[PDB]
Write an enzyme that holds these catalytic residues in place. Structure first.
Site, PDB file in Angstrom:
ATOM      1  N   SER A 175       0.845  -1.235   0.000  1.00 57.88           N
ATOM      2  CA  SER A 175       0.000   0.000   0.000  1.00 57.88           C
ATOM      3  C   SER A 175       0.870   1.272   0.000  1.00 57.88           C
ATOM      4  O   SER A 175       1.659   1.503   0.929  1.00 57.88           O
ATOM      5  CB  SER A 175      -0.862  -0.045   1.204  1.00 57.88           C
ATOM      6  OG  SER A 175      -1.399   1.246   1.553  1.00 57.88           O
TER       7      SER A 175
HETATM    8  N1  GSH Z   1      -6.071   9.006   2.211  1.00 57.27           N
HETATM    9  C1  GSH Z   1      -5.803   7.806   3.095  1.00 57.27           C
HETATM   10  C2  GSH Z   1      -6.113   6.556   2.238  1.00 57.27           C
HETATM   11  C3  GSH Z   1      -6.188   5.307   3.137  1.00 57.27           C
HETATM   12  C4  GSH Z   1      -6.907   4.137   2.407  1.00 57.27           C
HETATM   13  O1  GSH Z   1      -7.862   4.368   1.640  1.00 57.27           O
HETATM   14  N2  GSH Z   1      -6.502   2.940   2.702  1.00 57.27           N
HETATM   15  C5  GSH Z   1      -7.106   1.743   2.117  1.00 57.27           C
HETATM   16  C6  GSH Z   1      -5.936   0.788   1.765  1.00 57.27           C
HETATM   17  S1  GSH Z   1      -6.497  -0.685   0.820  1.00 57.27           S
HETATM   18  C7  GSH Z   1      -7.990   1.123   3.143  1.00 57.27           C
HETATM   19  O2  GSH Z   1      -7.551   0.986   4.318  1.00 57.27           O
HETATM   20  N3  GSH Z   1      -9.201   0.736   2.815  1.00 57.27           N
HETATM   21  C8  GSH Z   1     -10.166   0.100   3.764  1.00 57.27           C
HETATM   22  C9  GSH Z   1     -11.436   0.844   4.020  1.00 57.27           C
HETATM   23  O3  GSH Z   1     -11.490   2.073   3.651  1.00 57.27           O
HETATM   24  O4  GSH Z   1     -12.305   0.168   4.585  1.00 57.27           O
HETATM   25  C10 GSH Z   1      -4.371   7.845   3.484  1.00 57.27           C
HETATM   26  O5  GSH Z   1      -3.561   8.533   2.866  1.00 57.27           O
HETATM   27  O6  GSH Z   1      -4.011   7.202   4.538  1.00 57.27           O
END
Ligand code: GSH
Ligand code: GSH
Lengths: 207, 207
Positions: free
Chosen positions: A9
């Site tokens: 990530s």
């Molecule tokens: N703008 C955030 C983006 C974080 C993000 O979207 N992470 C995803 C990585 S796959 C996530 O954790 N998705 C899970 C969810 O939103 O339930 C950052 O910079 O930390």
């Protein structure tokens, strides 16, 4: 400090490079999103938005990668080199961080994620938004070696996590000469590059 | 300082309320985006990304609303109340700023802009992303009066600009009681509320 992450990530990698640049060893905790670990009460109590990266520093929980990078620098940096105190220098960095999130990496997610996670056909109109974002970055780099000025900052590290993900996605960075020059330099000077690249090769598996 | 803006624009309005909270009178300059005024050579020299808001402080050009807000406080604030120096307090603010851009206002633009600017049918699946964003905000507000702690900060002012735009879009904020309470309080305490509200009524014309 606990650090909830996945190695592929980009937002997690930007934090890991910042930690290396500060000489900090995070306690890396894989969080299995596919298995829904982030959606259970124990993780929701830490981060109700259920995203990675998440940092836990004692009883302080924090998420949003670029907030975490700045926190690490402001709290733990021995000097302000990675996030200078001068308001104008800091402001250019901050603008680059919002660019990275809302323009550059947004273009990545919007164009690639539907192909690699949803099996949807690529949309050529969304590719044009990537080209636009790289053109901006190419312009921002005119006249300086680093993204927001003349030294390595968290703006570089955030943007480097993003642009290294574009490399493994087979995007032709060479079409943006200032970007290509800045990127090649950062592979030689950015602390934690090797760990970032190993994570990129893990993300690459999605392609 | 020159401020390139439209009154209806939520990211513009967040900056205007911050200026009012600092006792700063910006030299406001309307930009005719429909005519491509932001795409002309003169504006590109100031901001090659051709977005509003843009601040020009002397010879220093800056864009990204949330970068501008923080620059104004860091450079011109008589104290740090709106953006406290304590790294943990500042980090929560910063996470809320990134939330505002990438989760809350993103959900606004994604759902409403195709209707009001492109004559496309509403997408009920995109409405669910607004509901998720408001659910998160409602959670963030538990146990505090303000978005990132116990005092008014730039996080409040950014989120307020966004939530007031949802009000004029006819979104039912009452379904989120902590948000409703916080919002009603900010209409009484946030400097520059009247100007922000006048600008929301301008934006409302697009609906
Ligand atoms: N703008 C955030 C983006 C974080 C993000 O979207 N992470 C995803 C990585 S796959 C996530 O954790 N998705 C899970 C969810 O939103 O339930 C950052 O910079 O930390
Ligand atoms: N994340 C930016 C958003 C800026 C933005 O998208 N502004 C629009 C307002 S209509 C704009 O200027 N669009 C013109 C363009 O991008 O060419 C911020 O917070 O300032």
């Amino acid at each position: 400090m606990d650090f909830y992450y996945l190695p592929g990530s980009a937002p997690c990698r930007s934090v890991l490079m910042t930690a290396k640049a500060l000489g900090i060893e995070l306690n890396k905790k894989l969080l299995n999103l596919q298995a829904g670990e982030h959606l259970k009460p124990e993780f929701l109590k830490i981060n109700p938005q259920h995203t990675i990266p998440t940092l836990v520093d004692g009883d302080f929980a924090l998420w949003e990668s670029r907030a975490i990078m700045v926190y690490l620098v402001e709290k733990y940096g021995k000097t302000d080199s990675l996030f200078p105190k001068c308001p104008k220098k800091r402001a250019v960095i901050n603008q680059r961080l919002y660019f990275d999130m809302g323009t550059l990496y947004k273009s990545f997610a919007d164009y690639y994620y539907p192909q690699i996670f949803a099996k949807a056909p690529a949309d050529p109109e969304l590719f044009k938004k990537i080209e636009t974002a790289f053109d901006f970055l190419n312009t921002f780099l005119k006249g300086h070696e680093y993204a927001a000025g003349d030294s390595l900052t968290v703006a570089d590290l955030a943007l480097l996590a993003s642009v290294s993900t574009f490399e493994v996605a087979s995007f032709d960075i060479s079409k943006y000469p200032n970007v290509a020059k800045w990127y090649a330099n950062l592979k030689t000077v950015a602390p934690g590059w090797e760990e970032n690249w190993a994570g990129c090769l893990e993300f690459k598996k999605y392609f």
